[PDB]
Amino acid sequence: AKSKAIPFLDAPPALSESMPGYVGFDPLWVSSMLPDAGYVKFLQEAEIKHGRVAMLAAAGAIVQDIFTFPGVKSVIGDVKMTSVHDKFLSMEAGSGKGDMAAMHQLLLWLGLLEIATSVAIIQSFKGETSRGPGEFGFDPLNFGKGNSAGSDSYKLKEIKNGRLAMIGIGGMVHHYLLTGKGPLQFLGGIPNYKSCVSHPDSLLPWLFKAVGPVLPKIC
Amino acid sequence: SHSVKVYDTCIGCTQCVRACPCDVLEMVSWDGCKAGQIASAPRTEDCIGCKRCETACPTDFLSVRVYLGGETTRSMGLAY
Amino acid sequence: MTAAYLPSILVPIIGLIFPGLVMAFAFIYIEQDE
Amino acid sequence: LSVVAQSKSDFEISDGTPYTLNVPLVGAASFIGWVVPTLLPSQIALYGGKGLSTAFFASIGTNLAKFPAPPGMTDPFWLLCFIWHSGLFATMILGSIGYNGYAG
Amino acid sequence: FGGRGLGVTVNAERWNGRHAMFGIFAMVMTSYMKGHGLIPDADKVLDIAQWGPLAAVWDGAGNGISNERAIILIAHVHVLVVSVIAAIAPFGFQDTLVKEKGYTPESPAGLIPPFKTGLTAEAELINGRLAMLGVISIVTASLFTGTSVVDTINLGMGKILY
Amino acid sequence: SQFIKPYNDDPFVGNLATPVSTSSFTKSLLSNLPAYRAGLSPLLRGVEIGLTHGYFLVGPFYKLGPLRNSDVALLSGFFSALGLIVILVACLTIYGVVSFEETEAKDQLQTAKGWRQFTSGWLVGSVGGASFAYILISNIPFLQTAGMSML
Amino acid sequence: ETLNLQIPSPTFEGSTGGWLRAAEVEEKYAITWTSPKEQVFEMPTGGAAIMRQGENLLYLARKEQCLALATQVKNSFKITDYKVYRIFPSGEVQYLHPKDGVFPEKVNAGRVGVGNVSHSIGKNLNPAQIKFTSKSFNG
Amino acid sequence: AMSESVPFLKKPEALDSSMAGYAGFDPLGLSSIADIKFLQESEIKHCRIAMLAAAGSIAQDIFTFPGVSKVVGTAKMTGVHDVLVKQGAMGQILLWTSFLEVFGTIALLETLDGKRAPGDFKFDPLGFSKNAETAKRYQLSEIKNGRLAMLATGGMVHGYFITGKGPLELLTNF
């Protein structure tokens, strides 16, 4: 029982060939770290949630570079990606001092939805439910033609685009953390570090402390 | 277990046997004393070492002698 | 002091790891049936 | 924790004995049976012309206005709170004894 | 006891072999790292006001650990925490430090294992013996020559690192 | 009505059935705790207990430790928790070595493998829970004080 | 002879003084006796129990606890009908007391004397004499 | 057996389609902690109070009773509470609603035992529910505008805590 993606390695025992977006890639056997029946379902739901959040973040960063909604510019000014998260948070009760609750409203409603999914994942883990990973019944426009779970091909598409967007939004965040350019300026400025935008330190400035002292710090 | 001995000075008064809280001692037939009986120690694995037998014994030096030895669950009187 | 780094290396090891290891291994030896 | 109603759930106070805790009825009756007598006013500086419940209910709001700040040691909140709950716990205890046991 | 793969066994031989290969890497890496001054504030002496009496050293000048030494130690602390988590909660496939108690010991290699140039156990054990011997060799060379280990490693490699 | 009875119908066992011991509320809490909850592997029991214990461990070390008034207070508190967690894991390991004979059973806590599973889960969860507390305290100024940021 | 496990137990409301895990994993002791009355007695492990008219049965952790009850049952209720058993977790029930149907303080034929030393206690051997020798000090 | 409102959740055990206003919404399992009938009586009480509260907000915008402007100058939504505690109006309403709650407490014990339906006080003077089919849809509509008025009452009083305007004055003065 060898693996498809890596022919030489032995196939990871917990993975089943019946789970979408599977090519036998699990060298570290993260799928075997818990013996429980629903741990692989937890891992699959974690992958899909990470992928959906990442797709939203990647599209969000691109479109934020394209334009902004009316009035946003007079409040936040000229921040671009993670800095806009910081800028709102400097102007919000509890975290900062101001008249805004933008990231907090997002936390409120996402958190209501997420505690609901908390109960869903807990029920799905212990085998009390015959629900697959990622399925919340959300399919308002009939796209799977009678099943909200969707077809095997469209969930494979969802997982693959999700994995791509995880990588892509990670790239975009780090490219911003050093150039300050944001997605479209970075992709335009294919010679880069030559002229970069002065952008603020994040809420985690310690992480950018080996750049100059140990690493080259071309910027 | 504890080691319990009966010496031939036993007058067969049965007092050690009555005082024993763990039924270690009993009376066996004899012909060396007027009472026709001597104390015996057949169940010393149950001896807790209280030495109530020695207290009960009336001979000048004790006919019954307890020698405290290796400790067990029984001889340490442990209910746990 | 010459080799002044030695107390800051050896005192935590002798004072914490050394008893922590002999207590750990003595406990195993005193609690084994065979 | 949880509250059990007068109507029969499968709650058991111990291993095999089901016992209806009357948490709605006792808590409601004990609260009202203590708060209403306690409405009796008194022109004393602790009460301030109100009753013990009302001076207390007034002192919850005044200290809630300064929400992060706690009431001070000489603040009347603590004395009012201790006295109100002491009677309230006593009426709850006596109310549970009276209702659960005598059943009427 | 000692039937769990501890002591002079091939399990211990392999494990110490892996650590000495990593250690040769780490010694080379620190030689190159402090040769170019890429350890920040390498000479700066830590203050007991911030770190407490663990920072004290009692060398006549400064009476405190240097920042380079603390940074190297914190790097080792990273791989020690990894080491503990891998010892007590290992991976599903990973070779375990301790053994089942009734395990069958791997057969001892001997003077030299079969030359299997792959990512094999023969290559691992050969290179591990070589690295352990290299650790000793570097230690003795530095002690006798009087030079620092960092300098001794640089000279043996032909001053490539710095 | 009587609230105290013999324990599990046995008048001569060394226990009583009291409301603290055997109420529906108590039974509920005990049965749903990670140590006693059904459908949990010993490894998962260790993880949930470990996450809980490691998370609270960080706070007393950080707020009351020797380096509490320094800016390295949280780092010192986490490493102090990590040191306690490692010491406790050694305690768990040696308990397993001396308390359980080696048998194939692994889905019970009181087995040699099941204890080794539980110990593995507890160490991972403890470091995970302590790390989560470290992240939360590092970033949120309310947790760094006792809530004293508001005053 | 064998313990009839179905014998009813004295009415007791329980106590913390009863037996612990060592009784269910090492050994347990039981005592049975006949009562002519439905009367209150004192448990060796705690408070008071009521023995039922007819046959009673208890379980205790120590042999001394069964005999301490037997002493009390014979001194205040004049029940001499008590039989003490040892019970192992294998199910084996071992009759203990009175071992041959007759009380130990009464002589019985077929009892062999154990522990009996032919001389008086002063005639033992000095420890030096039996040092590095297996010979016993009782002569 | 899946929840209707939350498709990925199992149908709440204590909940049933016989209950008025049921949609399968209890993702937290609070219907098991407290008794479902106590919760129904509590919800219906909250429904009716907040329906009066929302209508009271709206009407007090639209008009006030004769002489009320004498007593309340500028107090609008919850300021009128503060000034009419001084006057006797709030104490009067508190006394009479507490009078009613005494028999409401008897009725809650009655519905706990199982004799009475929650929220059922037999108050149908104008015979609205006589048909037997209207009665069900009236129960559903009562809970629907009851829940909506709970949310609305909160959403107006907080809009007034922000601006001070009140509901209609918030709308007309954007």
Ligand code: CLA
């Ligand atoms: C009986 C002898 C003895 C005793 C009581 C001590 C006592 C001490 N030494 Mg040690 N030392 C000794 C011999 C001894 N020394 C010898 C002979 C050497 C040369 C190898 C050293 C080298 C040495 C160093 C390099 C350092 C100390 C340090 C210290 C201090 C802290 C403890 C420590 O880190 O130990 C560590 C000690 C060693 C690793 C050396 C081995 C200790 C001896 C040889 C073994 C004695 C065994 C003993 C007979 C039986 C003990 C078992 C007992 C339960 C029966 C403490 C004052 C530290 C210090 O100064 O801190 C301020 C430190 O850095 N010592």
Ligand code: CLA
């Ligand atoms: C503090 C309030 C209070 C007090 C003083 C009493 C007192 C009494 N109740 Mg009542 N009861 C109460 C609250 C109270 N109840 C509430 C809230 C409920 C509803 C849940 C009931 C429901 C109830 C029923 C259904 C029945 C009683 C009955 C009784 C009588 C005897 C049984 C009993 O509870 O013994 C309490 C014994 C005493 C109070 C006397 C002992 C004297 C000592 C000093 C006790 C003092 C305790 C405490 C310090 C007093 C606190 C007062 C205040 C500061 C809180 C007794 C007169 C029964 C009865 O006799 O019928 C009329 C009966 O059938 N009660």
Ligand SMILES: CCCCCCCCCCCCCCCCCC(=O)OC[C@H](CO[C@@H]1O[C@H](CO)[C@H](O)[C@H](O)[C@H]1O)OC(=O)CCCCCCCCCCCCCCCCC
């Ligand atoms: C596996 C993870 C499961 C949960 C996952 C949730 C989040 C996962 C995705 C996150 C990615 C998006 C980032 C969003 C970050 C939100 C940050 C945030 O909102 O913070 C939320 C809070 C508070 O943090 C801030 O609070 C401020 C006011 O002080 C503001 O109001 C802000 O809302 C908030 O950001 O942080 C915590 O949650 C801390 C943990 C819970 C603390 C409860 C109170 C403390 C209890 C202590 C008492 C116990 C006994 C003490 C003993 C005596 C002590 C002296």
Ligand SMILES: CC1=C(C#C/C(C)=C/C=C/C(C)=C/C=C/C=C(C)/C=C/C=C(\C)C#CC2=C(C)C[C@@H](O)CC2(C)C)C(C)(C)C[C@H](O)C1
């Ligand atoms: C499901 C459901 C529905 C729905 C829905 C919705 C809203 C679905 C949204 C789907 C989305 C937004 C998917 C987006 C994926 C993004 C990807 C794969 C890109 C990653 C970036 C990369 C590779 C890059 C890069 C880059 C690098 C690193 C450097 C940068 O300088 C620039 C650059 C860009 C070049 C609806 C409502 C229709 C109903 C239906 O019945 C059911």
Ligand SMILES: CC1=C(C#C/C(C)=C/C=C/C(C)=C/C=C/C=C(C)/C=C/C=C(C)/C=C/C2=C(C)CCCC2(C)C)C(C)(C)C[C@H](O)C1
């Ligand atoms: C203090 C004070 C007084 C007063 C007063 C008064 C009248 C106070 C009244 C306060 C009320 C009724 C607050 C209600 C808040 C409602 C909330 C938070 C619901 C949110 C819904 C959510 C989050 C989403 C729900 C949902 C949505 C659609 C999405 C998911 C699904 C679902 C979960 C169903 C006085 C009178 C003394 C005056 C004095 O001067 C000040």
Ligand SMILES: CC1=C(C#C/C(C)=C/C=C/C(C)=C/C=C/C=C(C)/C=C/C=C(C)\C=C\C2=C(C)CCCC2(C)C)C(C)(C)C[C@H](O)C1
């Ligand atoms: C909002 C906010 C923030 C934020 C933020 C965010 C969103 C941070 C996101 C970070 C992410 C998602 C980084 C992605 C890392 C993926 C990596 C490194 C893969 C690496 C390497 C390989 C070889 C992959 C190889 C692979 C390939 C090629 C195929 C073979 C298999 C495989 C090995 C799997 C902050 C922190 C800035 C703070 C700020 O105040 C506010």
Ligand code: SF4
């Ligand atoms: S020491 Fe106690 S138990 Fe042992 S024989 Fe003497 S009296 Fe009996």
Ligand code: SF4
């Ligand atoms: S008490 Fe002494 S003398 Fe009496 S029977 Fe026992 S051993 Fe013999």
